[PDB]
Amino acid sequence: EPCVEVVPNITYQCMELNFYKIPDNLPFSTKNLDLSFNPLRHLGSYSFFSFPELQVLDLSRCEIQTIEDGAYQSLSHLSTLILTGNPIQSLALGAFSGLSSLQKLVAVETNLASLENFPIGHLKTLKELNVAHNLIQSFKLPEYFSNLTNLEHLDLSSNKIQSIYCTDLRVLHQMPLLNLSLDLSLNPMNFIQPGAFKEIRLHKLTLRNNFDSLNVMKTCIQGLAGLEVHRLVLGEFRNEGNLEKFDKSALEGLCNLTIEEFRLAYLDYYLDDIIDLFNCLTNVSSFSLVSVTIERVKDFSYNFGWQHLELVNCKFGQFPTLKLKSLKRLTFTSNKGGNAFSEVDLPSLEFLDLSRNGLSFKGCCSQSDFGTTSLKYLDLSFNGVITMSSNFLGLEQLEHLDFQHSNLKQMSEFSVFLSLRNLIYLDISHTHTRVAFNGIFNGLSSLEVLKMAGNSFQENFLPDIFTELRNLTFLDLSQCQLEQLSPTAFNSLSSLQVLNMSHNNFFSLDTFPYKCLNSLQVLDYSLNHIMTSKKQELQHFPSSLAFLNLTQNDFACTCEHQSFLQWIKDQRQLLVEVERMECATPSDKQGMPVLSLNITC
Amino acid sequence: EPCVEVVPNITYQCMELNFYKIPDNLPFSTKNLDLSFNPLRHLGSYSFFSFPELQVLDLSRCEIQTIEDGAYQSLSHLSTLILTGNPIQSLALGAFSGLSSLQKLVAVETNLASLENFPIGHLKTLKELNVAHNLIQSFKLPEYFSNLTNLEHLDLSSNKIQSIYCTDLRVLHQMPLLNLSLDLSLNPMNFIQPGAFKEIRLHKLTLRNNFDSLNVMKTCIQGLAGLEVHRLVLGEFRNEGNLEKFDKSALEGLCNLTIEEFRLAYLDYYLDDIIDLFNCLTNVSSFSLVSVTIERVKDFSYNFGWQHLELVNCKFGQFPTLKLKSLKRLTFTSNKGGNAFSEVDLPSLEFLDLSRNGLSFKGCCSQSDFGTTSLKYLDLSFNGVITMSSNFLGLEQLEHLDFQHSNLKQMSEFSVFLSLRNLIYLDISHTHTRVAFNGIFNGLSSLEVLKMAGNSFQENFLPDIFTELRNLTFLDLSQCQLEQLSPTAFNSLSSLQVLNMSHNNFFSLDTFPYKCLNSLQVLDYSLNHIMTSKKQELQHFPSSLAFLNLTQNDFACTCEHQSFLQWIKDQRQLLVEVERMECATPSDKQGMPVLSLNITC
Amino acid sequence: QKQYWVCNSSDASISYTYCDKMQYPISINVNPCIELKGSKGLLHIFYIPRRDLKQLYFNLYITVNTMNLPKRKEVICRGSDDDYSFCRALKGETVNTTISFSFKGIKFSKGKYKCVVEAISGSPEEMLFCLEFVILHQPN
Amino acid sequence: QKQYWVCNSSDASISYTYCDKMQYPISINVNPCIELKGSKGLLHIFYIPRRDLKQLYFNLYITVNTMNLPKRKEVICRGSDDDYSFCRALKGETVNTTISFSFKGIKFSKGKYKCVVEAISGSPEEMLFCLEFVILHQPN
Ligand SMILES: *[C@@H]1O[C@H](CO)[C@@H](O[C@@H]2O[C@H](CO)[C@@H](O[C@@H]3O[C@H](CO)[C@@H](O)[C@H](O)[C@H]3NC(C)=O)[C@H](O)[C@H]2NC(C)=O)[C@H](O)[C@H]1NC(C)=O
Ligand SMILES: *[C@@H]1O[C@H](CO)[C@@H](O[C@@H]2O[C@H](CO)[C@@H](O[C@@H]3O[C@H](CO)[C@@H](O)[C@H](O)[C@H]3NC(C)=O)[C@H](O)[C@H]2NC(C)=O)[C@H](O)[C@H]1NC(C)=O
Ligand SMILES: *[C@@H]1O[C@H](CO)[C@@H](O[C@@H]2O[C@H](CO)[C@@H](O[C@@H]3O[C@H](CO)[C@@H](O)[C@H](O)[C@@H]3O)[C@H](O)[C@H]2NC(C)=O)[C@H](O)[C@H]1NC(C)=O
Ligand SMILES: *[C@@H]1O[C@H](CO)[C@@H](O[C@@H]2O[C@H](CO)[C@@H](O[C@@H]3O[C@H](CO)[C@@H](O)[C@H](O)[C@@H]3O)[C@H](O)[C@H]2NC(C)=O)[C@H](O)[C@H]1NC(C)=O
Ligand SMILES: *[C@@H]1O[C@H](CO)[C@@H](O[C@@H]2O[C@H](CO)[C@@H](O)[C@H](O)[C@H]2NC(C)=O)[C@H](O)[C@H]1NC(C)=O
Ligand SMILES: *[C@@H]1O[C@H](CO)[C@@H](O[C@@H]2O[C@H](CO)[C@@H](O)[C@H](O)[C@H]2NC(C)=O)[C@H](O)[C@H]1NC(C)=O
Ligand SMILES: *[C@@H]1O[C@H](CO)[C@@H](O)[C@H](O)[C@H]1NC(C)=O
Ligand SMILES: *[C@@H]1O[C@H](CO)[C@@H](O)[C@H](O)[C@H]1NC(C)=O
Ligand SMILES: *[C@@H]1O[C@H](CO)[C@@H](O)[C@H](O)[C@H]1NC(C)=O
Ligand SMILES: *[C@@H]1O[C@H](CO)[C@@H](O)[C@H](O)[C@H]1NC(C)=O
Ligand SMILES: *[C@@H]1O[C@H](CO)[C@@H](O)[C@H](O)[C@H]1NC(C)=O
Ligand SMILES: *[C@@H]1O[C@H](CO)[C@@H](O)[C@H](O)[C@H]1NC(C)=O
């Protein structure tokens, strides 16, 4: 029964180690004692006495039948208790007595029955109270919540709460300050008599998969009246039975609340129209849908005040036609349905993300496409096929631009990035690109990070295309099948520090192309096959070089060009991994580190 | 003034050589004398006397004012005359007198006035008669056409023929046999009085860009009645002014003819519906549209008897929804508009070509997509992005399959060609493919031509994927960046004769991988960098090898592995181009053929 | 290694065993059994995790009759607002869930098909278990 | 080599000369002149070919300020039923045609722009002429 020492005399974990008592033969100053799945059928007063210091304590599935009085007494600084899965049939009054600084309290799968006979009355600093998967029958908040401030979460999901009445929540009418991110989900409820929620405030309210029909949902939405929830979350769960009807006059009566952030989070019904539905869900400054299939619908053109939208994992049949006078951010990511694109009109939009959809652009990118003129961010990566018919025109203010793993067409036929004078980032990695025009990267004067790994080169000869890109500090070039490089290629590049050049097919190293790089610190030549040089005129690299990875390529262990291996014992100060720099060419000299074999000839 | 001798004492051409008389100081047995742009302001009798034999004669832009009587007399076997651009103001009666075997007769841009005073009455064997761009005022066929049989073409386009009457074409009611592929295009005509064309027969009729409005066209179509043309061609030309209206009741009245092959060949009007238009163009066994923009239209679902369709260079906004119970061939090639695809239903279709459209397939290829089950041919090459969610299922009868320059996705995740047991051809060249599954080519047992040039390989090591492909006679592998090959890779391949392996990155040649290839005749290793071998155990190639291209790669000219260069002077019987097989490694030995430098060490 | 059967069909013989050191039990059922031809059905799962079923995902190592495939990575639940309710579980909490599935449109062939299943979840992303699935196949 | 002017605009100075041995005349006009910014207009051509204007196409060798581009290949007329009427001409036949054009949506920069124009047509596909276009550019 060795308790594993996770962090040396700080944290020990004793899980599934068949215990029956606390391991008090453990170091005296402990923190974060894990103790779960060890059978402890009952606890006693001052159980945790040899642990005067303790931050986190876990008792999960320790099958605690009863917690006796005065337990946990000699135990402060205890910030967390996790009493998950312990079936408690006798929680003695005054339990949890001495706990000076307790914030988190997780009692899940504990056989609770109500919250009025729940011993946390004396508690303070208590922020979370996760009472989920319990047996609680009515949502009547007990009175000791008056003394209990600082409570921020109260997650009672999966409970058997059936309905609500008026003077339920008579508490909360006495709270000048109260943040209660309440979450009531999966509660089968069929009645909310009016006026119950009134002059009340919340900071979240989550009701998903609880109403069995459209009429129940309708009149219970009628039950909540004047709620003022700062963020509402409705929907259902893919996991169980669901609604079999959803159209216009459902979601009605939702029009008396004061919402600011909405989220419908699932719908098994192929909804087919979006206005006169979600009708009184305007003025919500954050709209969001997730996993809801609205396949065939034409009229998306409508005016809403929606300062943030998000359509994640939704299916369609067409690209929706958005017309939003006020929408600053959009996230049309990982959708599956309609692989095309048509011009949307978002006059005030500053962020945009259309990633991993798979859609295709024929009108490419111009101010004519998105209707805006101040778009700071744009991600069209992991899409299908992007045809360049217009260099980014009217988008002169665009600092981020990703394209990686898309399919760029006609990228060599003109200067495609000719308008982007304020651009810091550019990732055209692994697009099916054949660089055959010396003016491809023309216009990018502020580009500092250039990633392109997996793009061919005309006849596999690196031309002088990195000119006027003088801020480039990071340059990625790997799997570009380069067999030669212009001797004057990386000039005007005085700020380049990282320079990736590995996984090409070279056979000669030299230092003239890198004679003048004042800021280079790393230079990677790894998965090449580099055997010899021009001639031993190979000179010292610039002083700044602090790293020269030369690992993983073949070598030639015979008398001639032993001067080359002498010039790679030139530097021991700049090599990296002398372990995988070895011999390849003879059979007798195999796997041998090069600086290691001392031969005269 | 040297007449160029094109084919030695057979054909001489004297073009733009400023002549004034026939060059009779030319060999005596001539054929195909070109003589054009030489000024010959007049001809005389027996002009071409020193050419007793002559097949083809050209007089284009020779500015012949008058052709005197009896000219061309001592001139038979003359199959062709090209009197193009010669302004003839006095063509004497009885000209073209002695011409025993004349078939073609091109008189274009000649200032003709009518066909009744046209000296070809005595002619026979005359097949073509191209009288285009002339000045002819009425389409009244003269009577000597009775004697004139064998006439197959009569192309009088761009003429000033204004209208037609009944007893025009009183001839052609006396012709038991008459093939007349007539073509009347660009003739400004505004009246066809009824009954004119009647009991008449043609073999083509081409009227494009001749009616100035919809009413003119309508009632002139009403003019032609009971024509029985075997192939009709209407439309217009992008080059000039065009119709400004085209909808349902245009093209009406076309319903009295007996058409079998139709072609509308251009339309500047964005037509927006296809039935109740082209309404009485059913039962035509060959439909065809070219360059006509029908962008927004939903109802393509309609029944026609159309045994061949073709939609070349058409624009749309959607993929048309074809529903044709009888359509054997389709050619949806080079369209531009709608880059998608939806399931069509062509129950009896045996050919299919969707090439260079650029559209994208999400449902890929299955019997569920094209509704047929006997499709012998399929070309989806040069398209956008093709996602494999189904190996060709229900298409077990498919002998041709092209994919080249498309974008295949998920091609390694399962045996994608698993149903195609009858497949001879396969071109997956230059798709963005990374071969990382030894079962990619599983199922292709009859494949004899396998093209794949430009497809990566996992770690650049050729695995044993060419198994069960025993009929493969042609194997393409170039630009596959292969650095190693399994020593047992091309086994079970006894029928391979051509074997392309160039433009990879090798550094060692050997003969063991090709120890057993009985049918190999060509073996290409060109754009590699091959310097040495395993060891001089390199053995004789199989007898069948008749060609070993080793050109264009680097070599190492020092004493050691002079035994390798000795083994490449092993064979002079199988080398190919000893001119570009040279030296690379030393500076003093540069550009030197290898078998050439005799050194001891 | 003890063999765990699941279900037979006309052309399937699913089973599985364990990879790793820990062998925490699990209960998987499928009704009706998968016909490796295009099938439909339900998948009933009874589990008690030793970690949080949060940011759960699968690494699949598939083997088509002694021929490896590439590696598959399937994200079941991401972060906020999962499609599923069971990915809100904690340690020691009973998961008792049901998920329906269907597929069609692919032909397979005979042979020992294998798939190594690696579940990963939690705060530092440590594994939850490994399982090894054996799926024979012989179409009718 | 004699210089052949075409038209000036606000940001264009088109001109051209001849490549090859034969120098058969041709007449090209454009109205109004191309603004290398997105333009519209008509193109009037008067020609008398020395071959057939059949299966005509262009090879374009473009040069962006001493930087070559790839080679362009433009098929004007293919075979049957051309969009244009002038591609039914024969040798010696007057071609007198008019074609309208328009483009927009691309930014260029300053510099000597060049384009070598090679027309090919006919039965054995021999060249019809070469021309060399010089297009200066200086936006306003
Ligand atoms: C010898 O070759 C090695 C590869 O073969 C180079 O490797 C290192 O690769 C690591 C990739 O995992 C880089 O790490 C990453 O570090 C960056 C730092 O900013 C983080 O952002 C990334 O998230 C992180 N990625 C992961 C998966 O951890 C290492 O940074 C990088 N080494 C260096 C020095 O940058 C070696 O670089 C090369 N030898 C030398 C001296 O460069
Ligand atoms: C040495 O390398 C040469 C290339 O570097 C190989 O070249 C030859 O390439 C030609 C491509 O133009 C092939 O020609 C074509 O021939 C086939 C015959 O069936 C025709 O279909 C194609 O239309 C035609 N294409 C063109 C553009 O003409 C030659 O066939 C081919 N040579 C041989 C023998 O096939 C040499 O092959 C290689 N040396 C040897 C001995 O193979
Ligand atoms: C230059 O660019 C290459 C492009 O790949 C960078 O390569 C990556 O290098 C890392 C570090 O070795 C590789 O990670 C290795 O991954 C294996 C498997 O995951 C792991 O077992 C190793 O311990 C190591 O972490 C990685 O595979 C490799 N490729 C990719 C696509 O990431 C390289 O790091 C760059 N050089 C510099 C100096 O930044
Ligand atoms: C093996 O496959 C390669 C793949 O390219 C074949 O290469 C092609 O070979 C021909 C013949 O040399 C090349 O044509 C050359 O073209 C230039 C320019 O057009 C011309 O000037 C030369 O005279 C010659 O014709 C061609 O460029 C080259 N590549 C392609 C894409 O066609 C090779 O022929 C194949 N080997 C065998 C034996 O078939
Ligand atoms: C379920 O399928 C398995 C495998 O197909 C069956 O197991 C085989 O059982 C037959 C019948 O007894 C034996 O002949 C084979 O030798 C067994 N092979 C293996 C690998 O186990 C199993 O019997 C099937 N179950 C039922 C109820 O039919
Ligand atoms: C048309 O444009 C050309 C080139 O832009 C003009 O030619 C230039 O003319 C100016 C004005 O006389 C001279 O200063 C330059 O030296 C000339 N340069 C070249 C290269 O020719 C021409 O003048 C313009 N035509 C008109 C009518 O303004
Ligand atoms: C709870 O509400 C208070 C109101 O001041 C806010 O500061 C706090 O951030 C909220 N809680 C959380 C977890 O955001
Ligand atoms: C980046 O480029 C801009 C414009 O060329 C220049 O003003 C700036 O100094 C450069 N460096 C940095 C660190 O911004
Ligand atoms: C003309 O008609 C006859 C009818 O027998 C046919 O044989 C011939 O092929 C036709 N002409 C052409 C050029 O096809
Ligand atoms: C091609 O393969 C088929 C089936 O494997 C076989 O019957 C045939 O003999 C092979 N060879 C030829 C030339 O068809
Ligand atoms: C899971 O829940 C269902 C719901 O009725 C129940 O019937 C079943 O017994 C539960 N599973 C277990 C193992 O208890
Ligand atoms: C071309 O045709 C038009 C048509 O009116 C005519 O005006 C013009 O003069 C013609 N061109 C020549 C060079 O004759």
Swiss-Prot record, chains A, B:
Disulfide bonds join 3-14, 255-280, 364-365, 557-583, 559-601. Keywords: Age-related macular degeneration, Cell membrane, Cell projection, Disulfide bond, Endosome, Glycoprotein, Immunity, Inflammatory response, Innate immunity, Leucine-rich repeat, Membrane, NAD, Receptor, Repeat, Signal, Transmembrane, Transmembrane helix, Ubl conjugation. N-Glycosylation of Asn-500 and Asn-549 by STT3A-containing OST-A complex is necessary for the expression of TLR4 on the cell surface and the LPS-response. Likewise, mutants lacking two or more of the other N-glycosylation sites were deficient in interaction with LPS. Residues 553-601 form the LRRCT domain. Glycans are attached at residues 9, 147, 179, 256, 283, 471, 500, 549, 598. Changing residue 273 to G: In allele TLR4*B; reduced LPS-response; associated with an increased risk for age-related macular degeneration in Caucasian carriers. Belongs to the Toll-like receptor family. His-430 and His-432 are found in TLR4 of human and several other primate species and may be responsible for inflammatory responses triggered by nickel (Ni(2+)). Ni(2+) may cross-link the two receptor monomers through specific histidines, triggering the formation of a dimer that structurally resembles that induced by LPS. This process may be the basis for the development of contact allergy to Ni(2+). A mouse model of contact allergy to Ni(2+) in which TLR4-deficient mice expresses human TLR4 has been proposed. This is Toll-like receptor 4. It comes from Homo sapiens (Human). The lineage of its organism: Eukaryota, Metazoa, Chordata, Craniata, Vertebrata.
